[PDB]
Design a protein around this ligand. Sequence first.
Ligand SMILES: CNc1ncnc2c([C@@H]3O[C@H](CO)[C@@H](O)[C@H]3O)n[nH]c12
Ligand SMILES: CNc1ncnc2c([C@@H]3O[C@H](CO)[C@@H](O)[C@H]3O)n[nH]c12
Ligand SMILES: C[n+]1cnc2c([C@@H]3O[C@H](CO)[C@@H](O)[C@H]3O)n[nH]c2c1N
Ligand SMILES: C[n+]1cnc2c([C@@H]3O[C@H](CO)[C@@H](O)[C@H]3O)n[nH]c2c1N
Ligand SMILES: C[n+]1cnc2c([C@@H]3O[C@H](CO)[C@@H](O)[C@H]3O)n[nH]c2c1N
Lengths: 237, 237, 237, 237, 237, 237
Amino acid sequence: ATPHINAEMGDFADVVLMPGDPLRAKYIAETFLEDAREVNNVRGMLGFTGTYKGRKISVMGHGMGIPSCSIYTKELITDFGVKKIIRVGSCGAVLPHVKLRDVVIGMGACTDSKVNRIRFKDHDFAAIADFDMVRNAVDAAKALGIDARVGNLFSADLFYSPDGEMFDVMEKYGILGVEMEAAGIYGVAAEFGAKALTICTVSDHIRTHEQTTAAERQTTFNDMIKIALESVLLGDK
Amino acid sequence: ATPHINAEMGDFADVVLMPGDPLRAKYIAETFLEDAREVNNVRGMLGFTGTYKGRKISVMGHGMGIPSCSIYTKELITDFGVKKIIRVGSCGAVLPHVKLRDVVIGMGACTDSKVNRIRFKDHDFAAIADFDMVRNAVDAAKALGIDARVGNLFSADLFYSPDGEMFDVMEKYGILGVEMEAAGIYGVAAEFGAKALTICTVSDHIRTHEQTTAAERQTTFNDMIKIALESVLLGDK
Amino acid sequence: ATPHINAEMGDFADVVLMPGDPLRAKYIAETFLEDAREVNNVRGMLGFTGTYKGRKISVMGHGMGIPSCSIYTKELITDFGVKKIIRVGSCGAVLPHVKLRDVVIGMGACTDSKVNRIRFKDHDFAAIADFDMVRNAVDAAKALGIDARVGNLFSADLFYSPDGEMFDVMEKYGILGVEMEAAGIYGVAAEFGAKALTICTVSDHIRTHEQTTAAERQTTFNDMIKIALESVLLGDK
Amino acid sequence: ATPHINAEMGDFADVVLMPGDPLRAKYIAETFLEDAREVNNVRGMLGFTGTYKGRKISVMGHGMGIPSCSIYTKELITDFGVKKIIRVGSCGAVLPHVKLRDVVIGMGACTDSKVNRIRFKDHDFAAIADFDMVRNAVDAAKALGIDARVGNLFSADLFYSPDGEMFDVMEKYGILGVEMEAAGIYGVAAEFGAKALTICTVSDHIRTHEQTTAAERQTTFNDMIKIALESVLLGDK
Amino acid sequence: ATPHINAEMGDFADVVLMPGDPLRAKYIAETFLEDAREVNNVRGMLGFTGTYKGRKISVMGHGMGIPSCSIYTKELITDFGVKKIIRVGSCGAVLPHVKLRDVVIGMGACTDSKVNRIRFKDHDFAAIADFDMVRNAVDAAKALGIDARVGNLFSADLFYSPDGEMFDVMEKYGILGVEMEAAGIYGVAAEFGAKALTICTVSDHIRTHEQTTAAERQTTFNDMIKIALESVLLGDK
Amino acid sequence: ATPHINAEMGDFADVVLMPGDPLRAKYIAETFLEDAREVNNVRGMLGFTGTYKGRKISVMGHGMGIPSCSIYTKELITDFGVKKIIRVGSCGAVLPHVKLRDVVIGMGACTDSKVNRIRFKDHDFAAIADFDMVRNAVDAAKALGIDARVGNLFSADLFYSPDGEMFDVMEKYGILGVEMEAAGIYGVAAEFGAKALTICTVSDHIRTHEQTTAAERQTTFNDMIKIALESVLLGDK
Ligand SMILES: CNc1ncnc2c([C@@H]3O[C@H](CO)[C@@H](O)[C@H]3O)n[nH]c12
Ligand SMILES: CNc1ncnc2c([C@@H]3O[C@H](CO)[C@@H](O)[C@H]3O)n[nH]c12
Ligand SMILES: C[n+]1cnc2c([C@@H]3O[C@H](CO)[C@@H](O)[C@H]3O)n[nH]c2c1N
Ligand SMILES: C[n+]1cnc2c([C@@H]3O[C@H](CO)[C@@H](O)[C@H]3O)n[nH]c2c1N
Ligand SMILES: C[n+]1cnc2c([C@@H]3O[C@H](CO)[C@@H](O)[C@H]3O)n[nH]c2c1N
């Protein structure tokens, strides 16, 4: 066990799906996994392990922000033998052609956090996903008839940023979605030699002011989860 | 009422105690307050309001890391009229004479986060607590016969820091505890015009490697809670 | 014509292969393209246009370093209608298992240049390639039976860096090759709305000290050229 | 002796009051101390040692700016055994409701200087005063019927800053006064293990351009000196 | 030989003139040198060695940008024994009193590149020319009837900069000309113990929008080369 | 008058010599100038105006550090019509062949201060002296038979720097002397449109540990003073 995860080696599968909300992790375990059992509840950050189409899968919340998800992902890798992490979250869009409920895959993640500069001698570390994991997700999405855009995400430290101008810069550079964790997960994956991918569903649009309701959530949330789970099966080959 | 808090104006008292762990907030509510009622459960980040010696007080978790706590403290201040925030957390110690379970009060908070540089045109913003709140905490600790050191905390973005050398620098400069939120809360308090204070209980010693369990952190660091609650009464006059 | 390219709209194909060495561009034009004609010679930066299996394609040098290649790629995009740029370069390796003449595909590019910070409000811009172009290159490589690793490159401003320790950091983070332009080309592609990809052939090993001669770099790194050209045909389909 | 102070161990008391102006130090020595003797005059930076209500005390100018006062305070601490340093100076106000003659106590000090980043591995060091010294000054002021605000000062490197908008940022974040030394003295105190405090009199208002009368400066200047001296007696017990 | 220069010790004189355009290097060798021999052609970066008034002198292009010229100047110094480097290039002017065709001598070079910060522990390194070389070029110009202006150049990384405001800052601070290499060459010269100088002819004016005629380009280019060559003879005395 | 200089337009000559020590300014006025009159004594920062061989000249202290001298030089330029400023100071040497009492002229000045980054959009501003003034000082030294090296100075914010390794870097890059003001004076001169020069006499050797006394620094570094004064006369003709 660790100070944040009260479990032991073996309680987690080698692949873990991670939404930011622990309550969504419970929803995933009960809705998509069979024989799911709770393997962690320290700080209410619920984690479960079950099977999907016979394959052992774990799902656990990671909390909001780079510092929060960096703790859980590092521990899962070094203390629980996890090889692959797939964040399945929500994000806001800044591009006019990116619509509410669209699925976006972060091949890369920009950030205003200082964590990768601390790791990389203050130079620019391109926080990227594992290529095969990205391709697997794109193919699974295609199989399910869901188009997914692949590109850069922006992982913000401040949900309430005092710099309103940054959103225009993000739009100019083609950022597909604004969230708060991808760059941190990719930094941890690179630091400890694991593989990661972040998939998000657009839950709010910064330009149109649109927002998903309770219902709109579960529906598009389900598509992203199916993409993630099926992408794992393609990955096993 | 807000994106991360499902409650309405009036559900929260004007003073809110905030541990990072929502289960610690639950324990505090069940053990130190009378007639506590749950006022938030979005994302499992439990928040409660009850009374302490007749005084209305709230307690709610803020999650781990500057990004997470910045969201919750900003929302409490701008949408729930919260005036004072007392963070009651845990921290790792680097100084040889600071022991496990000692209580430290952060009059200031250093950080390796970039959030205050973003707010302060890339200059050095001294993230500090409200002086009267610090004094009330010191006086309450004295009345309770509990030792408490007052000084600088260090708010890290990375619990698992790749820069071990930084701990030697922290020790040289007299840092009392290493945690992950104080500088962020102090930044939000100055940005939106409220008052804050961070009190921590040492949960680990970075040099000796001694540490407390997840269960101990969740429910046994009570000296700091008594100090926090009694300091509020002093502040009321 | 632009200030660095004496050619007219229509002289370049919509896709341009770009080595840093104009003499390598000449070699490519003479041996892989049919009916190639020279379309630029300003500053000796030779550019050509011809056909590959019936497909119109251009090849032009970009010089060494981010500043040099940023000028040429910007002009090709804004003034010559170029849509896709495939850099075909060389790089030094730091990983023990990467060998001389291995082909590496840069899905992302780290850098110690300040150009992307100037573009991105001093935050971390993840300089990435276009996903479809990366996938097309990976598929073309498999079809040709050529191994190719996909990952991060490091675009350095100083070939003769005084910071020897940075190579250990690169190694630790899995950097596939050290070169000098990828991050700059990806920055320009994002700023002006085009698509880019960098493929490199390992020309030196920074740890073992093995290296190829200038003649070898100029005319014998052909696997990457075959991959690049075939990846274009895949993209047209 | 050092290249900056022509004196020997023993010439200075364990507590030193330091105005920026050496002529102000002479004024304090002749007006508030008894049996005052000049102990330094190198570079005209006058320093005196005498007694106040039987307590041995020294008073010496520190010059203008962080680099100047960092030299004097460091030497006093390491070569003359000084334990406590109290800077007594002037500052400009940016807050509309802070008025001339007001006394401000710098519990913390922001800065645009690079000195603390050099000490603290380029992270944010919260330059803070010693808590007991702050408390002692607050109590002394109250005993004298003088009200005093406690908060953040901003220590500027450029009195004639080309960045006028920074004053608006300072105002937004509640900076009580703009001066040029506090952050530097607090950094030295922490580096060499001593205790420090900065007390300032608002000598001018940056917005109203209203400067305090050279007539009313002397009376309040005296208020500040009294608070400082009396605060030292409280600290002794 | 090196990967960038196919020549051997002895092939280059102790003094090398360097325009950015290799074709300009060929022109100089053919027009001003006696018995010029081509000594390098790798990557088309033409280098020649001949004599001027009996003095052995080399001329070779350096390519565009700091990273390109940093490679060549470093190698010339450490592997070919070059002692003095004189860059002869073009620059854009921002000052109203600096005119098209004026000759500017960069006694210093500002830059937005990160290379000198990498060399100088992230502090400000003043990239300067060798004083005697500056003096010799001023005197040579006077003897030829030309009044060169001596001052700061600005070496940009981005010819197509997204920061339009920087030109106004350059003007305010007296920058004589904008080019892309001087600061890099001065950094290499200081790093490896050689002497350097950059002389430029104003080829375009950012404010008046003037542009040098192809005819004006050749006549002025010639005056600059004469100044450079004659300055070398003064330095030998 | 200003809050730092109690004088009016006309009290200062158009050329001002400035040592950091006001007592050295007094010694210079009493020894080299005829009919010197005191024109400022605020904060004990003595300034005088007199004649040298019939030429009106002023001499005034500027205090220690960039912040201190930036105040005085700015005021002299804007409020007192000063056109040229010659700093005559002391510095520590790091090079083996630079000896105590050697005279060095700072053609340029590196720095670890943030003031020029604040002025120059966080890029590298090369803080340089006026070329003609440098030439006049070199010629004056020659005529007087005094040796003088011309090169880079390093202007430090911390006399007692915690980064000892920086001296090795300075030595590697050819720094002639370590002082604390040149870069700041050069920045002010460029910002307000005046001309400046820094000449220093080596007062300590950082490697051999040899050093001069406070008394020697105050009154015996006269060679640099003769060079400075005679350089002004050369500049007038
Ligand atoms: C502008 N819109 C948005 N901005 C920033 N983060 C988010 C998010 C995600 O949801 C949580 C914040 O509510 C975080 O965990 C983040 O990843 N959704 N919509 C967002
Ligand atoms: C605003 N005007 C200008 N801006 C930047 N560089 C240049 C140059 C020089 O010419 C080449 C770029 O065309 C570079 O090698 C550079 O030194 N000339 N005019 C310039
Ligand atoms: C190095 N370190 C960093 N943070 C903490 C903490 C605090 O507890 C949570 C992480 O365990 C965070 O919310 C942080 O503030 N406790 N002990 C810590 C330690 N040793
Ligand atoms: C350390 N290092 C840096 N760049 C390169 C390169 C590439 O080839 C040119 C320099 O040789 C540049 O254009 C760069 O991209 N090849 N081998 C390299 C090496 N070992
Ligand atoms: C390391 N170091 C730094 N500054 C100085 C100085 C100069 O003299 C004063 C400090 O002694 C400052 O004004 C500074 O310019 N002299 N010798 C120095 C030395 N060895």
